[PDB]
Design a protein around this ligand. Structure first.
Ligand SMILES: *[C@@H]1O[C@H](CO)[C@@H](O[C@@H]2O[C@H](CO)[C@@H](O)[C@H](O[C@@H]3O[C@H](CS(=O)(=O)O)[C@@H](O)[C@H](O)[C@H]3O)[C@H]2NC(C)=O)[C@H](O)[C@H]1NC(C)=O
Ligand SMILES: *[C@@H]1O[C@H](CO)[C@@H](O[C@@H]2O[C@H](CO)[C@@H](O)[C@H](O[C@@H]3O[C@H](CS(=O)(=O)O)[C@@H](O)[C@H](O)[C@H]3O)[C@H]2NC(C)=O)[C@H](O)[C@H]1NC(C)=O
Ligand SMILES: *[C@@H]1O[C@H](CO)[C@@H](O[C@@H]2O[C@H](CO)[C@@H](O)[C@H](O[C@@H]3O[C@H](CS(=O)(=O)O)[C@@H](O)[C@H](O)[C@H]3O)[C@H]2NC(C)=O)[C@H](O)[C@H]1NC(C)=O
Ligand SMILES: *[C@@H]1O[C@H](CO)[C@@H](O[C@@H]2O[C@H](CO)[C@@H](O)[C@H](O)[C@H]2NC(C)=O)[C@H](O)[C@H]1NC(C)=O
Ligand SMILES: *[C@@H]1O[C@H](CO)[C@@H](O[C@@H]2O[C@H](CO)[C@@H](O)[C@H](O)[C@H]2NC(C)=O)[C@H](O)[C@H]1NC(C)=O
Ligand SMILES: *[C@@H]1O[C@H](CO)[C@@H](O[C@@H]2O[C@H](CO)[C@@H](O)[C@H](O)[C@H]2NC(C)=O)[C@H](O)[C@H]1NC(C)=O
Ligand SMILES: *[C@@H]1O[C@H](CO)[C@@H](O[C@@H]2O[C@H](CO)[C@@H](O)[C@H](O)[C@H]2NC(C)=O)[C@H](O)[C@H]1NC(C)=O
Ligand SMILES: *[C@@H]1O[C@H](CO)[C@@H](O[C@@H]2O[C@H](CO)[C@@H](O)[C@H](O)[C@H]2NC(C)=O)[C@H](O)[C@H]1NC(C)=O
Ligand SMILES: *[C@@H]1O[C@H](CO)[C@@H](O[C@@H]2O[C@H](CO)[C@@H](O)[C@H](O)[C@H]2NC(C)=O)[C@H](O)[C@H]1NC(C)=O
Ligand SMILES: *[C@@H]1O[C@H](CO)[C@@H](O[C@@H]2O[C@H](CO)[C@@H](O)[C@H](O)[C@H]2NC(C)=O)[C@H](O)[C@H]1NC(C)=O
Ligand code: NAG
Ligand code: NAG
Ligand code: NAG
Ligand code: NAG
Ligand code: NAG
Ligand code: NAG
Ligand code: NAG
Lengths: 141, 141, 70, 141, 141, 70, 141
């Protein structure tokens, strides 16, 4: 007598679980939309900031960043013209909804890159979303 | 003795329902074809079609539409420049195999659109077969 | 051995005129058969490709693409 | 005992349907080739072809068209200077492998076009194979 | 006492049948999971083989073919420029793991081709697995 | 400890030449074993990917991808 | 009682098989994800190697080739000016990570070339990966 009751319970539960899975599938997508929260807009600038040889060739990156997400997002790493770079201070963070000029100091990860006045160098800024925004920096130092 | 009888009933019912589900999966296929029956050809035209002191602005929209299905299909909604528009009157029907310049009247639902003479606007035409088609509309006046 | 029972072309059902072809087991063949529209009239265009579904005696249905040659 | 039987049925059906979908994906490919069968060669000519007091203006349009496919293809719509035009009469057919000067009659659908003698107009010719071709038409009178 | 023993019998039998179905599912994997395919490398050539004024047109098709699988595979059909062709004669077989220049004769299944010297035609070659490789064939005359 | 009972590579059966390798409990380790074609002579191309199903003593059949390197 | 235990068996087995398929998907990545390519740098040269009035025409082809990948790659065919050529002899192999001047002899697969001194001909060199590099070859005589 129990078999029919077990089958009934499993049928109804299967309906419920399938509907729950369907809803979860859609519930995923607003999370994934955060992968493109940030846009880097306008031409940035890179400037010599080394203090006449008193620092390990530390440069200044200024870029206008727009954040459309609901969370503050920070710059985790930067690559300039193929070369890795390391942020010298604490990472800048862009608040939600803002469009603002982020400025941060940077160091060569290896070697000593030489820049020419007025040249354009492509840099990829990697933000905490994992999003990598390409941008163009004009050297001004 | 009851349990074996119940198990027999449930086994046969499971066979029947599983076969029915498989056949339904096979039967779904023909309905998919109709999702692409229509394609919009070339640019279209928006025109201002409202009188002085009228309650509402109404725009005549003309687009060339090609239907490839067996059945007549009609427009259900249009979204121009991001704003959704509401279709006035009886929506035009596009005959089964014909290519026709179709014209229909729309009125803004979200807010007043500031169309500019001679400007080009992106739009999405949504047809009754559940198909959306990109289109480019020139505002003639 | 398996035989055709119906075909649906461009969302329109067609009836398999005549003795429906039978496909022998384990064999690859060119199969040709005549069909008539169950209702209405087709709007085929030369060179166009139409999605169809061919339904066989097991109830299984194979989707296919048919080009109209005129 | 029912669940294992149902699972067996569904597993085999899934194998069958997945293989069918893969074969359909492979079978779609030949239809893509026909989308580029036709190319328009050189400039064309528009001419005024309506009598006094007629209900409508009708323009003869002549264009050289080259067909490379196995099947005859015909014109379905034309869009001149942004305005869509409606093709009068039986649309001309372009034989499979031939290059021909084709002529057809059109009438304006959106509104009266103010063609200027000797002017050059951009147009898009839309053919029955779903292909659009840019063309340049000189208005001869 | 009967109910408990019957329920235990059905529980053990359900375990048996479920494990059998699971092992069947595991055994299906080798048949469906079959990597490797025939890859068509570079452009092939179509050459007119019809001779002596005989009634039937035959064309040589030469293509470079690389069988990445572990099984012998043969050509079953070809579609050129939207037109189907029949593989005249014993269809060529491509040995496993081998890259070969493969040449075979074809005849039009219907109609007549419109090939032009030096033109490039998109074709699809269908192999015994049902997979179909798109290729480009240049007509050499 | 669980052992490799049989292997199928790209649909073709294969036979282990030595004693079957055995994976101890809780371990993650590289199993390496010799194999022979059960029938025929399969030919592999450098850098190609071949799917193989390894059947373990549990009856579990794990699909995996092997890249030919010889 | 049988139904619940059978359902639990199938749930666990489904977890097992699904995770196995996911791991297979992860294992496919290295085979498909293969960066690096053979790059043809600058213009190459075609020189007439036919000598002694022998019946078969042979041409020297010299090109600068940079293998950016981690695998040895060889040429398989070349197409010059729309005409296929066969790589006479043991086809040259390009070692990994190396830039080399590569030279190989070719013969026309059909017909005869029409090369003119000083003319530049577009060619396509097909390598063992199936990738094909376009190049420009100058005929030096
Ligand atoms: C940005 O400004 C920097 C400072 O003007 C430039 O780098 C300096 O370049 C000079 C010559 O190229 C080099 O001598 C400096 O090096 C160091 O010198 C120190 C002594 S002193 O020169 O300061 O008196 C040493 O103590 C030290 O060990 C040396 O490494 C060098 N300075 C640094 C910090 O590298 C730089 O060229 C300029 N432009 C860019 C794009 O960076
Ligand atoms: C590939 O070769 C084919 C054979 O030469 C070409 O087809 C032939 O095309 C010519 C016209 O271009 C046509 O006259 C041939 O038709 C036959 O002609 C015979 C007499 S003769 O012409 O040989 O002197 C007749 O006896 C016969 O009844 C005709 O059918 C025609 N041949 C066929 C078999 O169709 C074809 O043009 C060429 N190119 C391509 C792209 O196929
Ligand atoms: C590259 O070199 C080729 C070989 O010298 C050139 O082809 C030769 O072209 C000449 C005419 O320009 C032609 O006469 C050759 O044909 C043969 O001639 C022999 C006699 S002799 O000419 O050597 O005195 C005959 O015995 C023989 O049967 C002919 O076939 C011809 N050679 C070949 C193999 O075709 C070619 O023009 C040159 N340039 C290019 C762009 O290929
Ligand atoms: C480079 O960026 C830094 C900010 O990180 C700027 O440094 C500031 O300089 C002003 C005076 O010019 C000081 O009052 C601030 O305290 C500095 N801030 C930090 C964090 O050091 C600098 O001005 C920028 N421009 C350069 C170096 O040319
Ligand atoms: C907009 O379209 C409407 C119909 O969709 C057109 O209305 C007709 O206009 C003509 C005169 O132009 C009248 O004779 C008809 O009685 C009107 N009604 C119908 C149902 O045809 C209108 O002309 C169009 N307006 C513009 C500016 O294009
Ligand atoms: C379309 O033309 C009509 C007039 O025929 C315009 O309607 C009125 O225009 C005046 C002046 O801008 C406004 O004060 C009224 O409010 C308008 N009426 C309505 C109902 O909007 C109308 O603005 C024109 N629309 C466009 C897009 O040009
Ligand atoms: C426009 O094209 C039409 C047909 O598409 C032409 O109509 C023919 O005109 C000639 C005289 O010019 C008559 O003898 C024929 O009876 C007409 N009909 C057909 C079907 O040929 C017309 O000539 C063209 N007009 C212009 C101005 O080019
Ligand atoms: C083409 O020529 C015809 C005359 O053969 C023109 O038709 C009439 O022209 C008068 C004067 O402009 C107008 O009042 C009528 O309304 C016109 N009739 C029609 C049906 O439009 C026509 O305008 C000419 N078209 C072009 C583009 O030149
Ligand atoms: C086309 O391919 C066929 C073979 O598939 C070639 O036919 C051979 O031609 C040679 C030369 O006359 C004969 O010795 C052989 O007996 C033929 N074999 C067959 C099977 O027909 C033909 O030469 C090829 N043509 C071209 C232009 O490549
Ligand atoms: C074309 O390349 C071939 C080699 O690929 C060269 O042939 C060599 O020629 C030299 C000089 O006569 C001989 O010593 C060698 O034995 C030849 N080797 C081979 C493999 O043929 C040929 O010289 C080159 N020609 C040009 C003009 O560069
Ligand atoms: C680097 O960052 C530190 C703080 O972390 C700051 O005091 C310093 O001025 C920055 N620049 C240099 C050249 O050290
Ligand atoms: C909207 O459409 C209806 C029916 O076609 C028509 O009667 C009405 O006049 C239209 N709106 C306006 C403002 O004219
Ligand atoms: C089917 O078509 C053929 C023509 O090829 C005709 O002879 C036959 O009568 C038709 N039969 C039916 C049932 O439509
Ligand atoms: C429109 O096309 C038809 C079909 O050829 C023709 O009879 C008719 O006259 C054309 N229109 C005019 C105004 O002549
Ligand atoms: C195929 O073509 C060859 C010509 O090379 C001819 O000898 C043979 O009879 C043809 N066979 C068929 C079935 O078309
Ligand atoms: C196969 O296994 C045996 C041991 O069973 C081993 O000695 C031998 O080297 C292996 N390979 C060959 C090629 O025999
Ligand atoms: C390739 O050309 C060379 C001439 O340098 C010749 O010795 C050799 O026999 C040719 N080989 C082939 C297969 O044509």
């Amino acid at each position: 007598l129990s078999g029919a009751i077990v089958a009934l319970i499993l049928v109804i539960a299967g309906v419920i679980i399938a509907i729950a899975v369907v809803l979860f599938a859609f519930g995923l997508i607003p999370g994934i939309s955060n992968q493109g929260s940030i846009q880097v807009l306008g031409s940035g600038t890179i400037t010599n900031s080394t203090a006449s040889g008193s620092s390990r060739t530390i440069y200044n990156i200024t870029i206008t960043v727009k954040n459309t997400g609901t969370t503050s997002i920070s710059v985790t790493s930067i690559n300039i013209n193929g070369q890795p770079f390391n942020i010298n201070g604490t990472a800048p963070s862009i608040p939600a909804g803002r469009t603002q000029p982020i400025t941060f100091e940077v160091t060569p990860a290896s070697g000593k890159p030489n820049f020419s006045p007025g040249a354009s160098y492509t840099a990829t800024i990697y933000f905490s979303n994992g999003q990598g925004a390409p941008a163009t920096l004009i050297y001004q130092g």
